[PDB]
Every structure is written in C-alpha cells, then in structure tokens.
C-alpha cells in the first residue's frame, strides 16, 4: 500500500536511471511496429530493461519505509 509511506528523500539519480531505462525500452515500440511481437531473444533484451527499471524504482521506495 502507498498509505504506509513514511517521510523521506527522493533519490534523483535512481529516478533518472529508472526513467532512462523506460526511454530505452521505448525503442521497441518503433522497431517492432505494429505487431510489437518479440521472440525469445527480443524478450530477454526488453524484459532486462523492465526488471532493472523496477530495481531502481524499488530503491526509491526504500527511502520511504518500504523493505524488499
């Protein structure tokens, strides 16, 4: 829940990295248009961007009392 959020500081660097990865993952919307269907190799590359992004977003939530 977000209601359990405690006071804290936002990690600008981790947010910049988290938003950068989603920008790099946006290229797949262009290069794989319009079906957007990935194979096994394209999925591994794409999901690697989504996972690393969440790893940065989790570090952001850490400064507000969220453990993982």
């Amino acid at each position: 829940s977000y209601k359990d959020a405690k006071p804290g500081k936002i990690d600008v660097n981790e947010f910049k990295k988290a938003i950068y990865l989603l920008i790099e993952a946006d290229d797949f919307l262009y290069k794989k248009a319009p079906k957007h269907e990935l194979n096994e190799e394209e999925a591994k590359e794409f999901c690697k961007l989504i996972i690393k992004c969440q790893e940065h977003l989790n570090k952001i939530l850490a400064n507000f009392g969220f453990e993982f």
């Binding site: 938003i19 920008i23 946006d26 290229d27 919307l29 290069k31 794989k32 248009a33 319009p34 079906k35």
Partner: protein
C-alpha cells in the same frame, strides 16, 4: 474559451503505426536525443564547437543554426541578393524556394527538364542558358539555386555541374540539401557551393523547427554581419544564442547522424528492394532509375482500377493500411503515391511490402 480541445491532445498513432511519410523519415529522433529532451525539459551545451564540427562534416568554411531550410534560404537572399535580383532555380524546386524569394523581394527563373515523364530529370546544363538570356535582356542574376534532391520524385542531381557553371559566371550558388544533409554524405567545396542549407527535422534526426546554414568565407562578412547597437549580436541571425529543444536534439543526434551517413547504401538497399518488389504488382517508379534516394514516387494505375469499383472510393488504400497499422500515404489519392523506408528495420521493410501485395490482391 473552450479548453477541452487541449486536454485529450495526447492521442496519436506514432508508435502503433508505421509512418511512410518521406518528410518525417529522416527526422525521427533516436533514444539518445529523447534523453536530452528529458534533461532540458524545462527549457549549456557546446554550441560553438558543434558549429565547427558541422562545418568540417560538410567541408565548408562557416556554419550557423537556423529554424529550418526555410530560414536558410531567406537569410542568404536577404543578405547577399539586392532587392529586385533574379533567382534561377530548377523546376522541381520546393515551394519554400519561391516564397522566401518573394519575401526577400526577388524574382525567379525556372530551369526546364531534360526529360519529363517518367524521369522528370532537371537539365543541369540548361542553367547557363537561362542566365545568359537574363543577362542579355538585361536582368541581373543574384543567386543560383539547386534542390539537391527534390521533394516530389526524390531525384538526385550532379550539384558539381551547377557549381562549376556558377563559378565561371561568378554567381553565388545555394545548394538546397533539405533531403540530402544527414542522410547521404555531402561535400561543400567539392560541389563548388557557396551556400548549403539543411533541414534538421527532415534529414538530421532532430525535432522541428531546426536547421543549419553552412557558407563560404567569401560571404562570411555579410551573413554574420554584426549589428551597430550591439557589436556581438548578428543581424540576420537576430542575435539568438540558439537555446531550446530542437538545437539540443540536433547535437544529441549528431553522432548518430555522422555514423548513419557511412551506412547510406544500406538504406538504398532497402529502397531499391521496395521498388524492385512492388514493380511485380503494377507500380512504375517515376523519376531517375534506379533510385538514388529513399524518397520514391510510384505511379499506381492498379490502385485507380480498384478505387473505381470499391465502396470506399480512393480512400480504400488509406483505410486498408490503417487495418494493418501503416500510415504516411495521402488519403483519397490513388493515381500515384509517395513513400519512404529510411531508418526502417528490414523486418518492417518486408512487412510494408507484403502488406501492399495483400491489399492489391484481396481488393481484386
């Protein structure tokens, strides 16, 4: 005042569809430019150094930033040409070459074709013949313009021919490279050009409006003419430090631009594939054959015969492409189309070609 029309403005098919608009093919920003947009969202990069590198990239003397190729044509005609002078240009010139000339208070002379249908190739040798007929009148020619690649057929012209003639008659030469600089390699001194204009949002992977004006040292004192009240701010440049988003996207995409020009044949390979594969249906490539640019103009008699017996008239071709996630074609027009596959992945190139083959076959 209704503000509802600005709320849901974030609705587009720019990622769910494959755009085949030739104007927007070379203006697609990479991921490195999108990051720069984020960093300068609110709106100090090395501007001075970028202007030296872009000059070396074009092998020119000097260079300055503009708001497109529209500005670049007006800057020279207003700083070099005197009010009333004549501008001799090719017949396949872009509309902005006439509007800017009329804004700079000048006159325009057109150069005919070497052959019309289907090539529509410009007679580069006929340039001298037109000037002589103007000087014998005698009107004074102040500028010689040549669209390196036109925006109707995408034909390439030997700019050195016109540049060699311009030098013999001692008349300035503006080489329009809106469809040239950024895609294919261009050499300023080699084509003997005095001025070179570019379109950053059409061929240099930048966002609109943006452009570059490269010129020789001969006219450096006129273009970069400083003001009197302010001995720093340039007159024709309006003393702008060139800040904002389009200039940043240009510098951010510059290493991508400088690297994709060496792989230009790989983009012509895509282009020539499309021509040689669609000509099995009934399409006929207009312009110079084979294609020397990504901008292709197919004559489509087949699409006309289907449009005469389809419920959606001539809008059937625009609708059938929407079903397959493809855009960039003028709706209602079936007599001839204008597309491009520059930058597209080869998987997407096959997707486009195979789509059209299924349209012409299913619609009888």
């Amino acid at each position: 005042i209704n503000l509802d029309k600005y709320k849901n403005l974030t609705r587009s098919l720019t990622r769910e569809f494959i755009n085949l608009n030739p104007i927007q093919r070379g203006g697609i920003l990479p991921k490195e430019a999108k990051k720069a947009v984020y960093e300068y969202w609110d709106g100090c990069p090395p501007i001075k150094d970028f202007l030296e590198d872009i000059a070396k990239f074009l092998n020119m003397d000097c260079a300055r930033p503009t708001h497109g190729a529209r500005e670049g044509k007006f800057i020279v005609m207003h700083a070099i040409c005197k009010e009333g002078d004549y501008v001799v240009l090719d017949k396949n010139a872009h509309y902005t070459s006439y509007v800017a000339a009329e804004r700079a208070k000048l006159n325009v002379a057109e150069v005919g074709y070497e052959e019309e249908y289907p090539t529509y190739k410009i007679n580069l040798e006929g340039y001298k013949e037109v000037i002589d007929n103007l000087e014998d009148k005698g009107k004074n020619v102040g500028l010689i313009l040549l669209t390196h690649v036109d925006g109707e057929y995408g034909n390439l012209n030997d700019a050195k021919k016109v540049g060699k003639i311009a030098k013999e008659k001692g008349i300035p030469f503006l080489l329009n490279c809106a469809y040239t600089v950024g895609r294919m390699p261009v050499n300023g001194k080699e084509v003997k050009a005095d001025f070179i204009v570019a379109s950053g949002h059409k061929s240099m992977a930048a966002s609109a409006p943006c452009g570059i004006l490269a010129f020789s040292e001969e006219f450096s004192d006129k273009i970069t003419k400083t003001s009197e009240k302010f001995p720093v701010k340039e007159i024709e440049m309006l003393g702008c430090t060139s800040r904002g988003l389009p200039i940043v996207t240009l510098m951010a995409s510059f290493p991508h631009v400088v690297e994709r020009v060496k792989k230009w044949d790989e983009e012509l390979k895509k282009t020539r594939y499309v021509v040689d594969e669609l000509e099995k249906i009934g399409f006929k490539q207009l312009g110079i054959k084979p294609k020397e640019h990504d901008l292709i103009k197919f004559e489509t008699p087949v699409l006309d015969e289907i449009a005469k017996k389809d419920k959606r008239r001539g809008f059937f071709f625009y609708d059938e492409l929407k079903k397959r996630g493809i855009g960039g074609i003028r709706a209602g027009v079936t007599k001839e189309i204008k597309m491009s596959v520059y930058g597209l992945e080869w998987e997407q190139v096959e997707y486009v070609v195979n789509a059209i083959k299924e349209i012409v076959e299913s619609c009888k």
